[PDB]
Each structure stands twice: as structure tokens, then as C-alpha cells.
Enzyme design. Structure first.
Site, PDB file in Angstrom:
ATOM      1  N   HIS A 199       0.813  -1.172  -0.027  1.00 66.25           N
ATOM      2  CA  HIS A 199       0.040  -0.100  -0.101  1.00 66.25           C
ATOM      3  C   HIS A 199       0.976   1.088   0.114  1.00 66.25           C
ATOM      4  CE1 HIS A 199      -3.402   2.495   1.867  1.00 66.25           C
ATOM      5  NE2 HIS A 199      -2.236   3.313   2.283  1.00 66.25           N
ATOM      6  N   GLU A 200       1.843   1.417   0.844  1.00 64.54           N
ATOM      7  CA  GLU A 200       2.791   2.316   1.025  1.00 64.54           C
ATOM      8  C   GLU A 200       3.800   2.623  -0.140  1.00 64.54           C
ATOM      9  OE1 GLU A 200       2.020   4.052   3.311  1.00 64.54           O
ATOM     10  OE2 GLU A 200       1.618   2.586   5.055  1.00 64.54           O
TER      11      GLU A 200
ATOM     12  N   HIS B 290       1.864   4.250  -2.999  1.00 63.98           N
ATOM     13  CA  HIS B 290       1.657   5.736  -3.015  1.00 63.98           C
ATOM     14  C   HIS B 290       2.849   6.424  -3.884  1.00 63.98           C
ATOM     15  CE1 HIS B 290      -1.637   6.672  -0.195  1.00 63.98           C
ATOM     16  NE2 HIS B 290      -1.131   6.071   0.871  1.00 63.98           N
TER      17      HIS B 290
ATOM     18  N   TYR C 129      -3.663  14.833  -1.847  1.00 62.33           N
ATOM     19  CA  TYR C 129      -3.805  13.974  -0.456  1.00 62.33           C
ATOM     20  C   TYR C 129      -4.940  14.713   0.060  1.00 62.33           C
ATOM     21  CZ  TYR C 129      -3.094  10.056   2.425  1.00 62.33           C
ATOM     22  OH  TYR C 129      -3.151   8.653   3.056  1.00 62.33           O
TER      23      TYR C 129
ATOM     24  N   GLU D 129      -5.706   6.998  -1.698  1.00 60.09           N
ATOM     25  CA  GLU D 129      -5.639   5.740  -0.486  1.00 60.09           C
ATOM     26  C   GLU D 129      -6.254   4.471  -1.018  1.00 60.09           C
ATOM     27  OE1 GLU D 129      -5.073   5.106   2.626  1.00 60.09           O
ATOM     28  OE2 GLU D 129      -3.676   6.622   2.067  1.00 60.09           O
TER      29      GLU D 129
ATOM     30  N   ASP E 241      -9.194  13.863   8.852  1.00 58.21           N
ATOM     31  CA  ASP E 241      -8.566  12.800   8.002  1.00 58.21           C
ATOM     32  C   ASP E 241      -8.215  13.371   6.625  1.00 58.21           C
ATOM     33  OD1 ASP E 241      -7.368  10.457   7.454  1.00 58.21           O
ATOM     34  OD2 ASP E 241      -9.336   9.546   6.842  1.00 58.21           O
TER      35      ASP E 241
ATOM     36  N   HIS F 291      -9.036   8.441   4.588  1.00 61.86           N
ATOM     37  CA  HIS F 291      -9.185   7.133   4.951  1.00 61.86           C
ATOM     38  C   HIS F 291     -10.363   6.518   4.973  1.00 61.86           C
ATOM     39  CE1 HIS F 291      -4.910   8.202   5.873  1.00 61.86           C
ATOM     40  NE2 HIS F 291      -4.683   6.615   5.542  1.00 61.86           N
TER      41      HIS F 291
HETATM   42 MN   LIG Z   1      -1.837   5.377   2.592  1.00 62.64          MN
END
Ligand SMILES: [Mn+2]
Ligand SMILES: [Ca+2]
Ligand SMILES: [Ca+2]
Ligand SMILES: [Mn+2]
Ligand SMILES: [Mn+2]
EC number: 3.4.24.27
Length: 316
Positions: free
Chosen positions: A142-143, A146, A157, A166, A226, A231
Site C-alpha cells: 500500500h505504501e 503511494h 492528498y 488511498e 483525516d 481514509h
Molecule cells: Mn495510505
């Protein structure tokens, strides 16, 4: 470091043994020369200065418990790089074999992991909410995704574009989890989240509402927390992607599944060819439809399923 490529052995966060690619030059370093311009893992030594020290080990054996998160961060970055190359023909996150760097043992009791625009960073968790985050291949993937988005669509973002960003990372992190065949599911972070509690996870793509995230556009979060719910609202997209892949009936709308491979093909194309930094959910639907059209023809089932899936989550 300049040295001799070799292979070491160690144990990951979950206690599993694996071989890892190392470089020998007096010490054995966590530096993998076999993938693009290399994968490098650093020790942040509980501090927040980055990247820290390139990981050095005396004997090419990584069985100490302090070693665990480094082993997994290093190994799972390799897997993710492999996924992108093999599956999508993409060389590293920039498409040009950029080196992949990660630091572990970041801060103390830090319950998170993230891509900072230059590298990956992993906390060790507080031991209750999380264990060291690099033990979750979906988290690592997932990271790293990005980074892929940063070099491609560049989704900002915040708000919808941030929720898309996300969802993209959860989608590809899940596809990588299936690629590696590491106890795959449609849940996010199950392997490192709340060690004491079985069966839970951070987020669910199959049923976002299970953890209180929206699974329909009519339920989206409109506030400011957030970053505008990047998220939270990703749940709507995650649900759409799960339906496209697996099929089902949601809010009375029926979707025929077309499978994971096609899901990944369609999303990767949308990401790399059609999305822009300010794309909103409605724009994502258009992009996904155009990609499937490109790939499979306007009168394909694939196209049809992409449409149904978005209608099902209420994205027009
Ligand atoms: Mn993320
Ligand atoms: Ca998972
Ligand atoms: Ca748990
Ligand atoms: Mn050692
Ligand atoms: Mn799993």
C-alpha cells in the site's frame, strides 16, 4: 555500498524464515542489488531522523528480534517490485528503476507506516494496537503504491482525490498480497493489527461498513478530519473494486465479477493514463470505464461490470 551480492537468512515479524538479498563489504548490509537500482533498508534506531543507518549485520543471519522488521521491510519491498515488473511491466515506482529505501524502528511506539515522498517509514507499533508494521505485505505494498501514484496520476492528498489515492494503495496492496499468495484476503492490515484480537483488521474492502466506513456515496463523510476523510471515503472505492473483481449484489445492484487480474489491469491503466491530480470519484468512474473500453472493447462484459460496480456504490 560497493560489495559482493549475496544471500542471507532471517526471520520476519510473524516468525517466518525467509532468505533475503544482501551485500557484503566487511559487514553484510540490507542492500539488494538484484532489483533495479537496488532496495536499501535502514535502521532509524527509535529516532525520527531519516533515513538512519544502512542496515549492517555481522554474520548474514537475521534472527534477532530487533532484526525482524528489517527483514520483512526488505523482503516485501522486493516482492512488491516484482509484482509491478512482472505484472505491469513497470520498473520500480518511477518506471525507471529508482532505488527503493525503507527505514524501520522509526520513533518509539509508533503505530503507523508511510511513504514520505522519498522513502518508506515503518513504526514498530505499541505492541497492542500493532506490531511492527512491515510484517504486513498489504501494508508495505500500500505504501509503495503511494510512490507509484506520486509519479503518475499525482492525486492530491485531500478530499475525493485523496480518497482515490488511498483506495488505489489498498487495491494494489491487496493484489500484491494475492500475488505472493501470503494468506490473501480483502482485508487491510490484518496481519499486524491488534495481535490480541483475531479476525479483525484496519479496513475491509469486502465490507467497509464493518468498521464503520462508508460503502455508498450517499454515506460519504463531508467534514475535515483525516484530510477530508481520505481514509474513510476510500471505502466507497474499495467496495467498487471488490465488486468488479468478485461480483455480488449491493444495495440491490447486481455485478458480475471479472476477477483480480482484470481488476489490476483496469486500475493500473486508469492510474497511469487517465487520472490527474484533482480527479474526483466521478472522474475515476470515467477513467475506469475508458480503460476497460481500451482493453476489452466497449461492448465487453468487463466494461459492463465496471459500470454496475460504480452504480452499486452510487458513483455516477
Ligand atoms: Mn495510505
Ligand atoms: Ca490483507
Ligand atoms: Ca488483530
Ligand atoms: Mn546477525
Ligand atoms: Mn491476509
Amino acid at each position: 555500498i560497493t560489495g559482493t551480492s549475496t544471500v542471507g537468512v532471517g526471520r520476519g515479524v510473524l516468525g517466518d524464515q525467509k532468505n533475503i538479498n544482501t551485500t557484503y563489504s566487511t559487514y553484510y548490509y540490507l542492500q539488494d542489488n538484484t532489483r533495479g537500482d537496488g532496495i536499501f533498508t535502514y535502521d532509524a534506531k527509535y529516532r525520527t531522523t531519516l533515513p538512519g543507518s544502512l542496515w549492517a549485520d555481522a554474520d548474514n543471519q537475521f534472527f534477532a528480534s530487533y532484526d525482524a522488521p528489517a527483514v520483512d521491510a526488505h523482503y516485501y519491498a522486493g516482492v512488491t517490485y516484482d509484482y509491478y515488473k512482472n505484472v505491469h511491466n513497470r520498473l520500480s515506482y518511477d518506471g525507471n528503476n529508482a532505488a527503493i529505501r525503507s527505514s524501520v524502528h522509526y520513533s518509539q511506539g509508533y503505530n503507523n507506516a508511510f511513504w514520505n515522498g522519498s522513502e518508506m517509514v515503518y513504526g514498530d507499533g505499541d505492541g497492542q494496537t500493532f506490531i511492527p508494521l512491515s510484517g504486513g505485505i498489504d501494508v508495505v505494498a500500500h505504501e509503495l503504491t503511494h510512490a507509484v501514484t506520486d509519479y503518475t496520476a499525482g492525486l492530491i492528498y485531500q478530499n475525493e482525490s485523496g480518497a482515490i489515492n488511498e483506495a488505489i494503495s489498498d487495491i494494489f496492496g491487496t493484489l500484491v498480497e494475492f500475488y505472493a499468495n501470503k494468506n490473501p484476503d480483502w482485508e487491510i492490515g490484518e496481519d499486524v493489527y491488534t495481535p490480541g484480537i483475531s479476525g479483525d483488521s484496519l479496513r475491509s474492502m469486502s465490507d467497509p461498513a464493518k468498521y464503520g466506513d462508508p460503502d455508498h456515496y450517499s454515506k460519504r463523510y463531508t467534514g475535515t478530519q483525516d484530510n477530508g476523510g481520505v481514509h474513510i471515503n476510500s471505502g466507497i472505492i474499495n467496495k467498487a473494486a471488490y465488486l468488479i473483481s468478485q461480483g455480488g449484489t449491493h444495495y440491490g445492484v447486481s455485478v458480475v465479477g471479472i476477477g483480480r487480474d482484470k481488476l489490476g489491469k483496469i486500475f493500473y491503466r486508469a492510474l497511469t493514463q487517465y487520472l490527474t491530480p484533482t480527479s474526483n470519484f466521478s472522474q475515476l468512474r470515467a477513467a475506469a470505464v475508458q480503460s476497460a473500453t481500451d482493453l476489452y472493447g466497449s461492448t465487453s462484459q468487463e466494461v459492463a461490470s465496471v459500470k454496475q460496480a460504480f452504480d452499486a456504490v452510487g458513483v455516477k
